[PDB]
Symmetry: D2
Subunit: 336 residues, 4 copies
């Protein structure tokens, strides 16, 4: 089970780390494609301000990265179709991390170059499947060649909305994610691509509203919720570690203790959707393997007569969590 | 014959109140601080009045004596009485009204002390129970009469949520709502993980490198300010890693079916020329509100209406300087004390 | 009677220059920039470091408006094509892009009508730190460097310390606010530097600087005598320099303090603060450098001595006010 | 049979010592805060992550991986039934720490500077001077454990005539989140830590004499507290007895790092984050070395990183273990 990684950004590198750890106890990466000198790439794989230092020997050569005596070639093709990693290296699936190949059409380029399947790490349209592992990965079939993992937010929200709706019937809901700052943001105020007024502001010293598609597109993952949710984000001054607040009108009348026990059930042995009642904070989830961690301590039911609002919340390592989700799906690709 | 204020407790709010009243003094409001009570050395207080990591350096000449703080050549005595009934500032200095921001006189019964020391009225910078009036300026200040000698300003959050909720209810009717305030870290929080007053596992965590959930009673208590919303709202807080500047999200079920443009138009009219409840549609972020004089600033760009047949959710958002805004609200209430 | 200023590059520094020129009140007439006027007006109006400009700011399709005055914004990628000489009568170009940074390349501005050009950060042109060596400017000068943000802090301290006591050798470390060149999270960066690649908000990060080494351009007696580097730390703005030196005179901290202090009297460029301030207190200050006597330390064991001195600076605002001071002089030579 | 540590004061350092000793002998704890909160803080940490063990509490004890650790609550240490690691900050004297000796403890290791009538030990610099009569030892400070080996080794190779240090240091517990009064009244201690670079006094260099006697009187320094939660670095600028080059200095210092668990080496161009959770008291970084000369006047700058919490604590443990051989 061999992976080629297109784009050795933060998610790309974390996928490397994750597959490496997994491989120590039982799929493997064989090649990477990226414009950066491998020397720097190796450095960024070894040292991480968020995730710590990789316990392994890392070096580079002029065309590769080396870990624990193994050589991982890095190509530098700006057009995916020219990546020779299939004949050259044995690549089965491509993890597509670049943000540039974000549609079925665009990613065909990988197929043209011989890859069996592709997993894109972002929303990539409605003409292919959007998978959140442990929610709708069962809909995968052998025919599925280009797939989308959705977003980091999708992977947190989906299971919460999924099970909440199955227990109680979500009529309508709104979401706010209080999200760590990201690479698309700036250190200091200044112009940015797209020209967005908020995109342009200093990430580390502001709370910054930000648009997401997560909720609005949730129907690609949970079709009965199409048209039922909207949301946005607030970008705040931490490096990593996020949380999502969902507020919904339900079909059923509930208490907070009832909501908590119902959802808890669905976290039992679930590697994608966890549970924590220790009153954690954001830092506590950095480096966790779940795509979403339900926090019963924040559950709130507001009612007067029989107008009811229910707020639930889940934590997530928007980096590491999302990535572990994508690796689960790469793995499910082998079984198709 | 100016309004004369005693400030009890020269902490962050006290100091800002001093600065605001000083600024108003320059184009005379006729309000002035004549005295302070605090147990910290005047030279440290003076240092903290002059320099501030959030709100900048005061453009005034500031120094200390061993019992006062001197500003632009005027002397402001700093009393040091741990018990408020002992502060001699009414007789010594002309104090009319006390601004009480210590956090220790947080009830009608406790603040009686100021009256016993001869203060005409007291404004408490915090929630202070239900046997006195809780006033949010420009929402319910019209309820004040001459018999009100001890008044509560509610909290910083109350001062943000109140007008939003008030005007939204007025226009559309709030059946039920919940709020989440995304809030700058505060004085009560810790720099690093460790034990804390009260024992709370969350309070105990490092504030600059975490998003920390936190309890609030602003929503639950809003009935004190807007009786019709009693028992209609709940909420909480997320403390985030900025020094100042906050926002509240309100999620409500309304009586009317609405659109976003409609909610926006309706709330907007109530911000116009409203010195307490402002408006900004320039797509601002939290630092843009640091230093603003509003108790709450409505942000139309974040409005959201979610609709699936008959069921509707409305989300509105307001920004505030949890320090400066709150404080300018209180100063407005003080000025209003003079009209009673 | 006035000399008309064009600004190439409306980045942080260029916008601060505008605010500074606006504030001095008793004049810019055009801008050149790649970014839409709307975003630029927004970034002029709002700032996470320096606050909200107290002026009416708005934008059009091809300009930004401040207090009823129109400031045309060209969008020419190539400096030689900017037409603000004819169109808007430009006399002087303030150049803050980073892409012209030599006599060679700033010649484009003169090719297009400009009298003089002020840049920031070679050797075939004068580097001017106002109130240290602006005297060397002459009418012959066409292109001049204001030096760097760091140079404008270090120059005056080093000049005056050397003047009074004689610097034999010295090393500096500037504990510096994070900058635009740095990154929010770990990843590849232009140049490829391993430390440049790291998360700036949550690390202390060593950084190469050239200010000490090039100080010779400003204070010829100090050429070859100083070295230094930076540590980039987690604040948006506000920085300090520590200079450690071997001096030709044996001294006490007070001797050093009193000596350096007289050079700050009425000095709008090199100030003095002994109130025990911290970095955020210098944000918004107009000095290129603010001596802090409270941090002065003399270490000695018998006749072997080291002297440590410290100055603070707003690396944004202080540097820019220095550029403004130079602009005022240059333009009217 | 094997050695039983008792920890007085379950603060950040005490807790990290607990964790480190578990990773590698502690049987009881004395702290005035509730076992539940202690438990939560042992399990979760913003800086050092979550403990990979199962932790719980009771009414009088902390439970980990099955084993149970009693938490006594005595404000007077004579009164703790139960070597002692003294982390409290309140027993900062040979005389004060006599209390733990009154309670029957063999030896006491104080995790702070504790005068000159006891020995201050930096493990792997001067731990050899310890003997069976020393019942109360100081481990000096976090900074002391970083500065010591660097200065010791540089001094032994080149001879320091005079030196000054600046440690660029993560913010600490004594500091505040927002501006306001603090105990002692210092104008700078009163200022918001997360958004300032803040000068702070230090005594580590002046006092280095207690660890390295030939350096007595030759060093001074200070700190700049900056906006990160952990991870620090020290710059030393010194006049030496010999002429050198940067390469020479690096080669010379590097050789004392070989197999040195207390003083390490890193030449990958790291940053503060990189040292968090590292086990060394100090890490030499040769990429930052600088020699400045004109004529025959020479200044030498060397730099070492450290985790001011984790390094210090791992240094302390190494000393606790050495107590045993004694
Ligand atoms: Hg990438
Ligand atoms: Hg979620
Ligand atoms: Hg991962
Ligand atoms: Hg609000
Ligand atoms: Hg105010
Ligand atoms: Hg410039
Ligand atoms: Hg300087
Ligand atoms: Hg300026
Ligand atoms: Hg050190
Ligand atoms: Hg440790």
């Amino acid at each position: 089970v061999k992976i080629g990684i297109n784009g050795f950004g933060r998610i790309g590198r974390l996928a490397f780390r994750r597959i490496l750890e997994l491989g120590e106890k039982s799929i493997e990466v064989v090649a990477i494609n990226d414009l950066t000198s491998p020397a720097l790439l190796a450095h960024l794989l070894k040292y991480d301000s968020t995730h710590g230092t990789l316990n392994a020997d890392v070096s580079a050569t002029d065309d590769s990265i080396v870990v624990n005596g193994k050589n991982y070639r890095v190509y530098a093709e700006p057009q995916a179709q020219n990546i020779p990693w299939v004949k050259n290296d044995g690549v089965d699936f491509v993890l597509e991390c670049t943000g540039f190949y974000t549609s079925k059409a665009k990613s065909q380029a990988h197929l043209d170059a011989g890859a069996k399947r592709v997993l894109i790490s972002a929303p990539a349209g409605s003409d292919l499947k959007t998978i959140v592992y442990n929610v709708n990965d069962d809909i995968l079939t052998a025919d599925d060649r280009i797939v989308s993992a959705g977003s980091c937010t999708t992977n947190c929200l989906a299971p919460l909305a999924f099970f909440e709706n199955k227990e109680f019937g979500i009529k309508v809901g709104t979401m706010t994610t209080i999200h760590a700052y990201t690479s698309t943001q700036m250190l200091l105020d200044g112009p940015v691509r797209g020209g967005n007024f908020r995109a342009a502001r200093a990430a580390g010293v502001n709370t910054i509203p930000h648009s997401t598609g997560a909720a609005k597109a949730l129907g690609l993952v949970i079709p009965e919720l199409n048209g039922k949710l909207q949301g946005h984000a607030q970008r705040v001054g931490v490096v990593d570690g996020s949380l999502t607040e969902l507020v919904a009108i339900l079909d059923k009348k509930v208490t907070a203790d009832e909501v908590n026990a119902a959802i808890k059930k669905h976290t039992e042995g679930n590697e994608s959707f966890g549970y924590n009642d220790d009153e954690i904070v954001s830092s506590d989830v950095i480096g966790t393997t779940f795509g979403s961690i339900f926090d019963p301590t924040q559950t709130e039911v507001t009612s007067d007569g029989d107008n009811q609002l229910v707020k639930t919340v889940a934590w997530y390592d928007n980096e590491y969590g999302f990535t572990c989700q994508m690796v689960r799906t790469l793995l499910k690709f082998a079984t198709l």
